[PDB]
Coordinates of C-alpha atoms and ligand atoms in Angstrom, one line a residue:
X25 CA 0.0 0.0 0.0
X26 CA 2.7 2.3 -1.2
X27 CA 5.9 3.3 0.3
X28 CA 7.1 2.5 3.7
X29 CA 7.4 5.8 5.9
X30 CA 10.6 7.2 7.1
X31 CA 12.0 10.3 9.3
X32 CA 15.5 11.5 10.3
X33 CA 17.8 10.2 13.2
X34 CA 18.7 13.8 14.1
X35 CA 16.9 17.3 14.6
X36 CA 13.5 15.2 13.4
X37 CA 11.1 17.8 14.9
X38 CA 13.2 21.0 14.6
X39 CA 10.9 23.2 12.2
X40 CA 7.7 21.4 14.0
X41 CA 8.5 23.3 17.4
X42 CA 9.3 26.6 15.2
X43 CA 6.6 29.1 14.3
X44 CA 5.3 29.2 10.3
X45 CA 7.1 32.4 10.0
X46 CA 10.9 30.4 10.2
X47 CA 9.8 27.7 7.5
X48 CA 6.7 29.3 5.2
X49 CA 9.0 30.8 2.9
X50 CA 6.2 31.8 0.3
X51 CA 4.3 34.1 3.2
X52 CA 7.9 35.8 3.4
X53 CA 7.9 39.2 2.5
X54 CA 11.2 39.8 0.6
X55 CA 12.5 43.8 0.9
X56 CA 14.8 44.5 -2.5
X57 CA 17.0 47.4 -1.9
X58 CA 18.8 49.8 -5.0
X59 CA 21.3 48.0 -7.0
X60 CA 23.2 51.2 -7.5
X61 CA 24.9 50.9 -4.3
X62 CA 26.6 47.7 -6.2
X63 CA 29.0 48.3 -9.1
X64 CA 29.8 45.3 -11.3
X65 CA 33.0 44.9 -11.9
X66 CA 33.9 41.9 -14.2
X67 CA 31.9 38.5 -14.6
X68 CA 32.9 35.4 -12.4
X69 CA 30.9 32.7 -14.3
X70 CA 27.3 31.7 -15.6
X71 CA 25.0 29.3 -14.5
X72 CA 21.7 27.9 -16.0
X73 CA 19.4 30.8 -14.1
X74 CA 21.9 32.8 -12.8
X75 CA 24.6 35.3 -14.1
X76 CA 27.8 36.0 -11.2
X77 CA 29.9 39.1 -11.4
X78 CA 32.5 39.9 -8.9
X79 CA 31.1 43.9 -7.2
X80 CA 32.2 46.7 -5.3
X81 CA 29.7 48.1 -2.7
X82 CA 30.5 51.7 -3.5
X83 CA 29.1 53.2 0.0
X84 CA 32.4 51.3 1.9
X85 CA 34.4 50.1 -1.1
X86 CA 34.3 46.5 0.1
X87 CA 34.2 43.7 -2.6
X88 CA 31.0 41.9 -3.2
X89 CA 29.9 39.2 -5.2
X90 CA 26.5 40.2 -7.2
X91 CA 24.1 36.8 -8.5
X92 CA 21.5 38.2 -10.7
X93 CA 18.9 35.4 -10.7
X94 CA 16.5 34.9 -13.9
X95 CA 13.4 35.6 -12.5
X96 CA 12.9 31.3 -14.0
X97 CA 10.6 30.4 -10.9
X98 CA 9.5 32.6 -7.9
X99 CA 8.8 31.0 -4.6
X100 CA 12.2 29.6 -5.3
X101 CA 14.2 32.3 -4.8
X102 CA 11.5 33.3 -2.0
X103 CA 12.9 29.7 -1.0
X104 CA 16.9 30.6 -1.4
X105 CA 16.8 34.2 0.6
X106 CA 14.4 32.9 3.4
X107 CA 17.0 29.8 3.9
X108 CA 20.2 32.5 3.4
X109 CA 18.8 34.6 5.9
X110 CA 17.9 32.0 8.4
X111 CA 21.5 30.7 8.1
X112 CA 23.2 33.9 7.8
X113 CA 26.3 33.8 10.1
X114 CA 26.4 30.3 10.6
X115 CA 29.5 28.8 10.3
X116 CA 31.6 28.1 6.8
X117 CA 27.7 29.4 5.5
X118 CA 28.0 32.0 2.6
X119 CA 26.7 35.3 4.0
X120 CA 23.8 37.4 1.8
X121 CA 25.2 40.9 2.3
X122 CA 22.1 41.9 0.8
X123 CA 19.2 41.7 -1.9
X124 CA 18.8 44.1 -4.7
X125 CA 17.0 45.7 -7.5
X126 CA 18.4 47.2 -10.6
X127 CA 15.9 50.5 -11.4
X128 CA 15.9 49.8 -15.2
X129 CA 15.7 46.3 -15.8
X130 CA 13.8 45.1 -11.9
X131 CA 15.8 42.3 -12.3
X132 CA 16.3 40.2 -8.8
X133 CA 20.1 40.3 -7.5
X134 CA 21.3 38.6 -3.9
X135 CA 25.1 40.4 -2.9
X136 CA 27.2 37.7 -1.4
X137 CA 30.5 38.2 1.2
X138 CA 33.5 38.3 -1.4
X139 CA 35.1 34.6 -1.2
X140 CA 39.0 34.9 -3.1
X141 CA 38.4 31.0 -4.4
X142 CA 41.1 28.5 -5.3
X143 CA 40.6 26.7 -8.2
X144 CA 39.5 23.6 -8.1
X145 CA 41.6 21.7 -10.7
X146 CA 44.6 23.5 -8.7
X147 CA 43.5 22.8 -5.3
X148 CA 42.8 18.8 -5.9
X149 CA 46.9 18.3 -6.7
X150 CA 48.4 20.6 -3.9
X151 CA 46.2 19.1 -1.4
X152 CA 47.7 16.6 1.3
X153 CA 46.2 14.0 3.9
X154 CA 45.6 17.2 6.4
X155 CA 44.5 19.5 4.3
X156 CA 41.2 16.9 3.1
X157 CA 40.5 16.3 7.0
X158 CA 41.2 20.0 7.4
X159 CA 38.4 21.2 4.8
X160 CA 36.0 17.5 5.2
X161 CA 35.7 18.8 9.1
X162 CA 34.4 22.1 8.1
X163 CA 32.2 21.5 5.5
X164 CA 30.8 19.1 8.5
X165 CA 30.7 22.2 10.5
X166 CA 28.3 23.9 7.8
X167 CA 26.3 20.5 7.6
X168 CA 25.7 19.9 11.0
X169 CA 24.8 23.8 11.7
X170 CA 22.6 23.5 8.5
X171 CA 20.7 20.7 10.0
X172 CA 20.5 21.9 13.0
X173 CA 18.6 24.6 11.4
X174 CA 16.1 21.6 9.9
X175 CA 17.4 22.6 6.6
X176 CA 18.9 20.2 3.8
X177 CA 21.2 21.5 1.1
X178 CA 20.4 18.9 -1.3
X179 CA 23.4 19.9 -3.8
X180 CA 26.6 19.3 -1.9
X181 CA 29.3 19.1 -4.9
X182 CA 32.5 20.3 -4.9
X183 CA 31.5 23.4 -7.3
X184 CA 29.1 24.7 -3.9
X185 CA 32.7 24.4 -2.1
X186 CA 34.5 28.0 -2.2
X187 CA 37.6 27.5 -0.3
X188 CA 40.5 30.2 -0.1
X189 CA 43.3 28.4 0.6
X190 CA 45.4 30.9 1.3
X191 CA 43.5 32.0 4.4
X192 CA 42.4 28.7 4.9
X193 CA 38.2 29.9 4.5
X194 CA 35.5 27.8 3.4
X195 CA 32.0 28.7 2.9
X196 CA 29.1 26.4 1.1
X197 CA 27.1 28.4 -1.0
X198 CA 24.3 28.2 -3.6
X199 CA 21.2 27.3 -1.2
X200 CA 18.9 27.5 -4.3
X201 CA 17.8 23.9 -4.1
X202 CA 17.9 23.7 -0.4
X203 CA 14.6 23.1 1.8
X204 CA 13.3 22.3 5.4
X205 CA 12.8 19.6 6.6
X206 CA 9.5 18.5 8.2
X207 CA 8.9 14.6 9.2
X208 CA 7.0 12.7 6.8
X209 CA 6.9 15.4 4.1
X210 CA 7.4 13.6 0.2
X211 CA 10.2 15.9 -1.2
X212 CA 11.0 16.3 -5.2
X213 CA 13.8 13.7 -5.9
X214 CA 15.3 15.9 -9.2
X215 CA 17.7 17.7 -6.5
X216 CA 21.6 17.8 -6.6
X217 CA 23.5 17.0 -9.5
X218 CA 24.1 13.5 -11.2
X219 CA 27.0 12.0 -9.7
X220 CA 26.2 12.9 -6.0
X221 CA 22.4 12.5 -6.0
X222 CA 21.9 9.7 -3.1
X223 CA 20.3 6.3 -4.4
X224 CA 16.6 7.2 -2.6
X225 CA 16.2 10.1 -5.3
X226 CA 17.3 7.4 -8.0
X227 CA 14.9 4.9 -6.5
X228 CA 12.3 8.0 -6.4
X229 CA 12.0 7.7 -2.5
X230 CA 10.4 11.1 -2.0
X231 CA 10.4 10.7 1.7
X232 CA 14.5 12.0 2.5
X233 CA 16.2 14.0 4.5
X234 CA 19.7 15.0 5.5
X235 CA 21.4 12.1 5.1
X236 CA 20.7 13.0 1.3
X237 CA 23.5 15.4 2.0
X238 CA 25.8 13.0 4.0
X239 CA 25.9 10.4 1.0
X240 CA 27.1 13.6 -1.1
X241 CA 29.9 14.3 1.1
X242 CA 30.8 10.8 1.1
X243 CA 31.3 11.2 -3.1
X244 CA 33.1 14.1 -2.6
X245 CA 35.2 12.3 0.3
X246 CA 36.0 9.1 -2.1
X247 CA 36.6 11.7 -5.1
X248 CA 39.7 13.4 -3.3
X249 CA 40.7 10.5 -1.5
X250 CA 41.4 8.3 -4.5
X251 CA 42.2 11.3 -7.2
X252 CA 38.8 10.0 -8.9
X253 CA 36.3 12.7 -10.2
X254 CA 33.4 12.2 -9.7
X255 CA 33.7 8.9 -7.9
X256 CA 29.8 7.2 -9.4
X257 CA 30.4 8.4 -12.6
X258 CA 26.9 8.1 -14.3
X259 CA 25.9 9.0 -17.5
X260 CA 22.4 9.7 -16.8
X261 CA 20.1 9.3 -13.6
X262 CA 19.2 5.5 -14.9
X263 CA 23.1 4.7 -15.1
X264 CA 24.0 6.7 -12.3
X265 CA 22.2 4.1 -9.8
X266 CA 23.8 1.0 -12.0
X267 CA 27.5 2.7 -11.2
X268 CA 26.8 2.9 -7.2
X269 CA 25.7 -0.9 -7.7
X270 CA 29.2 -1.7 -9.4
X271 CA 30.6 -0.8 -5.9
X272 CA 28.5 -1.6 -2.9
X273 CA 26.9 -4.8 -5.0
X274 CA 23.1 -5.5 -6.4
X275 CA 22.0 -7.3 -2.9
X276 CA 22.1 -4.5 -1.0
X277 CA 19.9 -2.7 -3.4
X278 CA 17.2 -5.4 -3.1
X279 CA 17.4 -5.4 0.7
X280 CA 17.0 -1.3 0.8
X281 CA 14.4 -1.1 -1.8
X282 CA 12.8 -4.0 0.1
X283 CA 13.3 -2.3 3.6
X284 CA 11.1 1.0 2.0
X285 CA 8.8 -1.0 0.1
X286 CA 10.3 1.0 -3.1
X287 CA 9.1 0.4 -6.6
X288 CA 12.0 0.1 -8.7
X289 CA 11.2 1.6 -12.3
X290 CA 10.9 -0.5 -15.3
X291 CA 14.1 1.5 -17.1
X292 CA 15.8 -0.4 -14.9
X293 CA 14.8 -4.1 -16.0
X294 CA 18.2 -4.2 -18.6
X295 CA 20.5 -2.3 -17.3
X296 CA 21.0 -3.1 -13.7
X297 CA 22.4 -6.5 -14.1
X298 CA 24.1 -8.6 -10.9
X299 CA 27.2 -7.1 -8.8
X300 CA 29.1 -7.9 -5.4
X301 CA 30.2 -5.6 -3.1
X302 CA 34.1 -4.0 -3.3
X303 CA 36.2 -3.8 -0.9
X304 CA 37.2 0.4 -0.2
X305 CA 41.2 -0.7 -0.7
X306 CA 40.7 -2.1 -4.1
X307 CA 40.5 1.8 -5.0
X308 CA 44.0 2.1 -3.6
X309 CA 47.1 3.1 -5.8
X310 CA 50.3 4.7 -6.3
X311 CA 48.8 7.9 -7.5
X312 CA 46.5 8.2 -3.9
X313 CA 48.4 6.2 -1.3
X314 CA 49.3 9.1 0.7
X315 CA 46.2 10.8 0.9
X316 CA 44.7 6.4 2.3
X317 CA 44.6 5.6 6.1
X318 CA 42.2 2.9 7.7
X319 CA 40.2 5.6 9.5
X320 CA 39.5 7.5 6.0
X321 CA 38.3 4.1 4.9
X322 CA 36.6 3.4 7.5
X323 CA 34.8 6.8 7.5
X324 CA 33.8 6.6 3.8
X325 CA 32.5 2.7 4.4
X326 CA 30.1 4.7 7.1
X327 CA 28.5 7.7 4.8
X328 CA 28.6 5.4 1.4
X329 CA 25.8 3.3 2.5
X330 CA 22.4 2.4 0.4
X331 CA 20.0 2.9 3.5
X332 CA 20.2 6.3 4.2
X333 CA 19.0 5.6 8.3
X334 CA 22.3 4.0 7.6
X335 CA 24.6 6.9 7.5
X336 CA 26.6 8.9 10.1
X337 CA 24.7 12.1 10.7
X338 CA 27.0 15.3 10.3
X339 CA 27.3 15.2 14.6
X340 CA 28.5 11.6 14.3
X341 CA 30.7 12.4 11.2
X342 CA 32.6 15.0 13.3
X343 CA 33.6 12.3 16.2
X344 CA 35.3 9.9 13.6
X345 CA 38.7 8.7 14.2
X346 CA 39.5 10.5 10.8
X347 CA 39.3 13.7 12.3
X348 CA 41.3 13.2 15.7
X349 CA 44.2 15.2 13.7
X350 CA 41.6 18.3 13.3
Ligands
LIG1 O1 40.1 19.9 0.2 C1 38.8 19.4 0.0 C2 38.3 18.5 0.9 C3 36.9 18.2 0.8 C4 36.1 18.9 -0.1 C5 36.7 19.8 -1.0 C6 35.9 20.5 -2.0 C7 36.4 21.3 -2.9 C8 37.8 21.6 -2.9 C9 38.6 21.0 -2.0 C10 38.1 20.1 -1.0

C-alpha cells in the first residue's frame, strides 16, 4: 500500500517546534534594496538561471559578489533568501550581504561576502592528507549547523565548495535547491546534480532527509581520496544508480528497496544486471596512497551506504577517528 514511511535520526522535529514564520517561505515578505549601491566589476561565471559578477559596494568600497537570478521560478528564490537569511552567520555558510533591485531592468540580485576562491583543478593536486581532513571537518561544520537549522542543502558538490586556501576559509554556497525539513513530508527527488544524488532520489524515495547530503559528502570524500572525479560516474540518472551498484553490489539494493517498500522503475529491467560488493582498498594506488589511512576508509564505508537511516549524521561524522588530527 505504497511506500514504507521514514523520518531522520537527528533534529527530526526541529521546524515542527518553530513558528510558520521560520519555515513558510512563500508568506515571506522579501524587501529588494537599489542595485546602485553595487558596481559590477567583471563576470565570475554563468549558470543555468543565474549570471555571477564579482562587485564593489560603492558606499564602503568593500568587494562583493552580485548573482543576478533569472526571474525562472519565484517561490524559489523566496525559498533561497528565506533559507540565506535564516542561516546567515552560521559557520563556513556563505553570508547574503544583501538583496537588490536594478531600477531599469527590476531584475532580482542577492550580494554575497566576497570569497577569493582557489581553483579547483589546482586545489585537488596541492592538497595533502591534512588539508582533506582540514576542509572534510568544516564542511561538517556547515552541515551539521545546516541541519540543526532543519534545513537540507540537497546539492553538496565540490563546485558549492568555495575554499581560499590561502587564508584557509570555506564557505558552502548556492542554497537555491535547499529546503526544510519536516517529518514525513514527500520531497521532489530531481535535487543535486548527477553524480552525488543519493540512491533514494534514484529509487524516487520522496520521503529524505539530511542524510541526502551525508551520501554527497561521502562522493566528494571518495573523489579526493582516490584522485577519482566524480567517484559514481553516471551517464544519466538510470546509469547513475547501476554505477553505485558496481561498488556496494546488487544485494544491497534489493534489501534497501525492500526495507522502504520501493518500486523500482521498469528503465531499470536491462540495465541493472548482478554485482558484489568492493572492498574500499581495491581503490587504492600509487597515484593516492598518501592521501589512504584505515580511518579515512573506515569513514567513507560509514557515509557510502544504500540505507540512508544507515549513514553517520553530520554530529557523528565530526567524532570519527578521521578527524582526531583536526
Ligand atoms: O580539500 C577538500 C576537501 C573536501 C572537499 C573539497 C571541496 C572542494 C575543494 C577541496 C576540498
Amino acid at each position: 500500500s505504497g511506500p514504507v514511511p521514514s523520518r531522520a535520526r537527528v533534529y527530526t522535529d526541529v521546524n515542527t517546534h518553530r513558528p510558520s514564520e521560520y519555515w513558510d517561505y512563500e508568506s515571506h515578505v522579501v524587501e529588494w534594496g537599489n542595485q546602485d549601491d553595487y558596481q559590477l566589476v567583471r563576470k565570475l561565471g554563468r549558470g543555468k538561471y543565474s549570471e555571477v559578477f564579482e562587485a564593489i559596494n560603492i558606499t564602503n568600497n568593500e568587494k562583493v559578489v552580485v548573482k543576478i537570478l533569472k526571474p525562472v521560478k519565484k517561490k524559489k528564490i523566496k525559498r533561497e533568501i528565506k533559507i540565506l537569511e535564516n542561516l546567515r552567520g552560521g559557520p563556513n555558510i556563505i553570508t547574503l550581504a544583501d538583496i537588490v533591485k536594478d531600477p531599469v531592468s527590476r531584475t532580482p540580485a542577492l550580494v554575497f561576502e566576497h570569497v577569493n576562491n582557489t581553483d579547483f583543478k589546482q586545489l585537488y593536486q596541492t592538497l595533502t592528507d591534512y588539508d582533506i581532513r582540514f576542509y572534510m571537518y568544516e564542511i561538517l561544520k556547515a552541515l551539521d549547523y545546516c541541519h540543526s537549522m532543519g534545513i537540507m542543502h540537497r546539492d553538496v558538490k565540490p563546485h558549492n565548495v568555495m575554499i581560499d586556501h590561502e587564508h584557509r576559509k570555506l564557505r558552502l554556497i548556492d542554497w537555491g535547491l535547499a529546503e526544510f525539513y519536516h517529518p514525513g513530508q514527500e520531497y521532489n527527488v530531481r535535487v543535486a546534480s548527477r553524480y552525488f544524488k543519493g540512491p533514494e532520489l534514484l529509487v524516487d524515495y520522496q520521503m529524505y532527509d539530511y542524510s541526502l547530503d551525508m551520501w554527497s559528502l561521502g562522493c566528494m570524500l571518495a573523489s579526493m581520496i582516490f584522485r577519482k572525479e566524480p567517484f559514481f560516474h553516471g551517464h544519466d540518472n538510470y546509469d547513475q544508480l547501476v554505477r553505485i551498484a558496481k561498488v556496494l553490489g546488487t544485494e544491497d539494493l534489493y534489501d534497501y528497496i525492500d526495507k522502504y517498500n520501493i518500486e523500482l522503475d521498469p528503465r531499470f529491467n536491462d540495465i541493472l544486471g548482478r554485482h558484489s560488493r568492493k572492498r574500499w582498498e581495491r581503490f587504492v594506488h600509487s597515484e593516492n596512497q598518501h592521501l589512504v589511512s584505515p580511518e579515512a576508509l573506515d569513514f567513507l564505508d560509514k557515509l557510502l551506504r544504500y540505507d540512508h537511516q544507515s549513514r553517520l549524521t553530520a554530529r557523528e561524522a565530526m567524532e570519527h577517528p578521521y578527524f582526531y588530527t583536526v
